[PDB]
Paper text:
The lasso peptide MS-271 is a ribosomally synthesized and post-translationally modified peptide (RiPP) consisting of 21 amino acids with D-tryptophan at the C-terminus, and is derived from the precursor peptide MslA. MslH, encoded in the MS-271 biosynthetic gene cluster (msl), catalyzes the epimerization at the Cα center of the MslA C-terminal Trp21, leading to epi-MslA. Herein, based on X-ray crystallographic studies in association with MslA core peptide analogues, we show that MslH is a metallo-dependent peptide epimerase with a calcineurin-like fold. The crystal structure analysis, followed by site-directed mutagenesis, docking simulation, and ICP-MS studies demonstrate that MslH employs acid/base chemistry to facilitate the reversible epimerization of the C-terminal Trp21 of MslA, by utilizing two pairs of His/Asp catalytic residues that are electrostatically tethered to a six-coordination motif with a Ca(II) ion via water molecules.
In contrast, a gel-filtration experiment indicated a molecular weight of 410 kDa, suggesting that the recombinant MslH is an octameric enzyme. Each monomer is composed of a large domain with a grip-like subdomain (G-domain: Ala141-Pro234) and a cover-like subdomain (C-domain: Ser317-Trp363). As a result, α6’ from another monomer, together with the four antiparallel β-sheets on the G-domain and part of the C-domain of the monomer, forms a large cleft on the edge of the αββα architecture in the core structure. The crystal structure analysis of MslH revealed that the subdomains (C- and G-domains) were characteristically involved in interactions with other monomers to form dimers as well as the substrate-binding cleft on each dimer, and the dimers formed an octamer composed of eight monomers. In addition, an architecture that would construct a six-coordination motif, consisting of four amino acid residues Glu44, Asn87, His259, and His261 and two water molecules (w1 and w2), was detected around the C-terminal carboxyl group of MslA Phe20 in the MslH:MslAΔTrp21 crystal structure.
Residue numbers in the entry:
A (entry chain A), B (entry chain A), C (entry chain A): 1 to 208, 211 to 439
Write the structure that this text describes.
């Protein structure tokens, strides 16, 4: 029997050194990560190779660029396989993502989710260890249009970028609501501005009894509703690569970045659940989600775990030394601002954004044990990111103390209850999933 | 008195050599262009410096990339000042636009509308001749988000790109229609998916009695309607650069690319009219529009001409040798396709798109005469692009014959009548604007 | 509680290897430096990246250029954060300072005080350690005009250089002395040579009842005097960066290079005292001065220490292997000179300059202990640089023996008495400041 352990974690938004402090609880986290066969995280920052140019990314909270020396903080902490597909990997454009891959390869760090072309971004990376091998696939459902990689044609090269999981939303409305929408379209003169497109394309492209108005899809249904669905091409392409990786490694882990919420902020979008189920149907041993910056529930599906969101494992956005002009413009200034003052005014001196809420400063590191591909243990290690501490101290991870760990483990159990997930709890505040195996 | 002549033209979508054929009407066009002090066109193609990667641009009709030798076709034909801000300048990304500027500078071709940063894209270019100087400013209202250039910050460099003229549209709806829109928002569960944004930002960002639903702005009014307005920052920045250029050149020409229609396809958007009036208020001597691929009206405002659209002066999209994989994917294929077959199937063997309509194959070259900044003549030269000819022959310009020129001059007069523009007509089918000077 | 130790030191003018000798007192110094969380020094030499060209710097004692391998001597000795703003950082011009930053970054050495532009030179550097973080800011009040860095404009790049603290001197003279100065100006014909400047600028620029003659500022006062004041822009910009750094690190240290004397050589200029007080008012935890090559007093201000001058920690000017032609020209030669003979004749075989005076060969290394930003200890370690030894042996640091340390500690106490500073003295000749905490 082959026995392999895998640590999982969420967003690694690292911008400073000294990631692991002298706190014994922080050193114990590093010992935990180093003790596993593979430790996975999501690199939610662009290590600067000097190459590239800042992109306009206000919806993502601004640019997230750091000195490349943060990569040594990541590996020294114990992380050894990096997922890179997310809404910040392209913060320095195509040249930036080329520089990131150069930096990662020169340091010997296995990574997936970005590439010089679409195939390269979709490929798994194979991390080989003496005890066995892990294949990591990384994709993101949250990114700016055009940032996805592209494969070459016979005449033109590809385009560097990220591995995409696109998705569409459809608004279910009643026939009465539907008629008003088409009435607004005609009476406002909006339909009159598509008159040329009717001659060009042959018919009004707004008639799909489906309907495209305002860039949104409307569908007549009995009761109002809201549905989301994966892009069939991305879903079937990513699923195909999972089947490929299953033949070439002991363990297949799919990492998926997704900000989009379900009916509630605690809930993943329905398309993300269909995606996660598809990955395990294709042979993946675990699905690790991230994006929201807080924890979501844990689902066991066909005896494999789905972590819909592990939050942040490092959170140092407000310590960024590199703020672009477009980010500075989101804040009205009388005189030029410095990065720290810009982030302090962006939040209203910490009264808004993520600072005042505890859910944004708790994290979780699951440690999974597999024996011949069968999950035999899933230990849960709550992580404290320092809620309420000064801005320069919070965001660095440590194993939470007993009292904080119990509160976090309670939250995870409550978030996981709709999936039927049960948890055993240890005296130290750690826990593990009840497995049907 | 200083006397200066300026030829204007629309989109130059050149992908092949032999731009000026041996046809005497084509050679006469080159003689006309060469005979002026300045000849302006809009470079609607990316000259390939080998650098860059194709971007996803399906809304613009695909990528538009050509051998850099087409630049010698452009200058040999008589064009001497290039506007470069449009929806295709970024078809090879930021590296492509850096390569384009390298190619243009190495050939000594003055250009505006793109730059290594936003200031560089906004700057006028000064074309100095023995008789005097012309300042060209170039901006585009049609481009993919993020393609605009960016200026540096203290910490981060800028971003190469185009000079933008952004604009917003607002839907005027009745209070009854407004209430249904907010009812759809709440009943579909759409408002429930913004619950986290209410805690983060402080309030529902959909409440501006203005309203943002579906990514569109809705405003309660007495009668349904549709309005557009320039981005105040772009308008005031571009206007500022026009005032700067007026102090440094005899003539200031503003070239603006705009696909967006008004109430009718023949009509420019209201924001474009406000922009054009603003440019002349600031000191511009002419405003030349392009984008739609057909002609629009001509307006005289404060004794200066506004050409809302001069159509295409060269139209060789279907002869492109460089089709990207994402463009190929817009066409369903059984076996791999070649560019010519791809463009033939993209249009349904020429039954759709621009091929079957005459308005897409007529053009116009105005020749303006200024004396000490006063417009003293505005001659109109209709151009034939070869409607109905084989795909490899159509798209090259020549002075239209008498019968075709008269039809085109009639169209221009009809399109210009709502502005009060009158035209004198010559025996050869050319004409000129009736000037109040 | 976070507990952090910081070693401070003065000018590091290192040009040779073997910085730490086999002497046990030298090895004990390295053990002391290595034992702290952060050890700061001022790099008073240009590590040669092969780039640059020697500048004319006779006022600073000539060029100070060394093999880049001296950087390994600096870090192996225990120094871990480098201040680089001083009157020698630009000895190889802008290319030299670019090469220095390349050399420092490739070796992983944190540094501040120089940059590719003014912002980069003003920024703090953040040194992160397991126990906490230190922010270092570095500026110089002594440099050749034009050597300060410059920030970019929209049209032009910045200029690499140093972080400046400019300052002006004003001569207070009586009205009788004032009238003679204006009489000399008119009667010598000096005022007649500004006749064109009166037409150009509008008025005589020598009339500010202030007065600018001979490039000096004169002001009428009741009694003759002499005052100095910081450049308000540099003071307010540096103060702003201190407030920024206070939000992002546990400790903020400001290092300021200043040759200028006060009323006495032992005294700092009044502008330097105002600067140091301003830094602590803004949140700095320590101010470390250097420049004079001898010790100055120590001030406690708002329970934070100000070391107006720690002298030299390494002094190997006369061992430089790289003497420029302009430096050689300061010495009259019959035949070409070698560096050692040039430095021996520059001093008159050691009868002039710094060789014969003991104050130039004593140094001091304070070791500060902070607990949550509160200074809880400030130990003083006298350093011996080998006064009276051969030129090739003197300049390397070691902990002074008991007798020499007591003499140095006495000097420091006497220099610090005007500030109210008291010292406790240990049996070994070390000491510490009496803290009001
Ligand atoms: Ca994210
Ligand atoms: Ca276009
Ligand atoms: Ca000095």
């Amino acid at each position: 029997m082959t026995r392999l352990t895998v640590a999982l974690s969420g967003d690694c938004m690292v911008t400073r050194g000294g990631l692991i402090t002298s706190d014994p609880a922080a050193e114990r986290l590093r010992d935990l990560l180093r003790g596993t066969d593979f430790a996975v995280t999501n690199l939610e920052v662009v290590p600067s190779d000097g190459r590239g140019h800042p992109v306009h990314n206000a919806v993502g909270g601004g640019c997230l660029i750091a000195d490349s020396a943060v990569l040594d903080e990541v590996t020294a902490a114990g992380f050894s396989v990096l997922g890179c597909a997310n809404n910040h990997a392209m913060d320095l454009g195509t040249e930036g993502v080329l520089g990131t891959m150069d930096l990662l390869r020169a340091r010997g760090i296995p990574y997936a989710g970005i590439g010089a072309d679409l195939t390269g971004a979709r490929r798994p990376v194979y991390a080989d260890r003496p005890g066995g091998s892990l294949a990591l696939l990384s994709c993101t459902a949250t990114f700016l249009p055009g940032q996805e990689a592209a494969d070459p044609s016979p005449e033109l090269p590809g385009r560097p970028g990220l591995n995409p999981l696109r998705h569409t939303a459809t608004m279910q409305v009643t026939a009465d609501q539907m008629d008003v929408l088409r009435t607004i379209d005609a009476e406002t003169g909006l339909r009159a501005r598509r008159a040329e497109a009717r001659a060009l394309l042959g018919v009004d492209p707004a008639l799909l009894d489906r309907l495209a108005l305002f860039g949104t899809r409307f569908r007549t249904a009995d009761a109002p509703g809201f549905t989301t669905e994966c892009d069939p091409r991305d879903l079937d392409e990513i699923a195909r690569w999972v089947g490929e990786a299953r033949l070439r490694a002991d363990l297949v882990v799919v990492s998926v970045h997704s900000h989009e919420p379900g009916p509630t902020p605690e809930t993943p979008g329905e398309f993300l659940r269909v995606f996660a189920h598809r990955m395990i149907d294709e042979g993946a041993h675990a699905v690790v989600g991230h994006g929201p910056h807080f924890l979501r529930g844990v689902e066991l599906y066909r005896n494999k775990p789905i972590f819909y969101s592990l939050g942040n494992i490092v959170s140092q956005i407000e310590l960024t030394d590199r703020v672009s002009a477009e980010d500075y413009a989101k804040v009205t200034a009388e005189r030029p601002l410095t990065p720290g003052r810009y982030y302090d005014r962006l939040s209203g001196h910490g009264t808004r954004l993520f600072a005042p809420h505890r859910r944004y400063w708790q994290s979780l590191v699951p440690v999974l044990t597999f024996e011949d591909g069968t999950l035999t243990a899933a230990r849960l290690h709550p992580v404290d990111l320092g809620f309420g501490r000064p801005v320069h101290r919070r965001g660095r991870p440590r194993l939470a103390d007993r009292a904080e760990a119990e509160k976090t483990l309670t939250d995870v159990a409550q978030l996981s209850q709709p999936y039927g997930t049960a948890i055993e709890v240890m005296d130290d505040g750690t826990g593990e999933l009840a497995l049907d195996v």
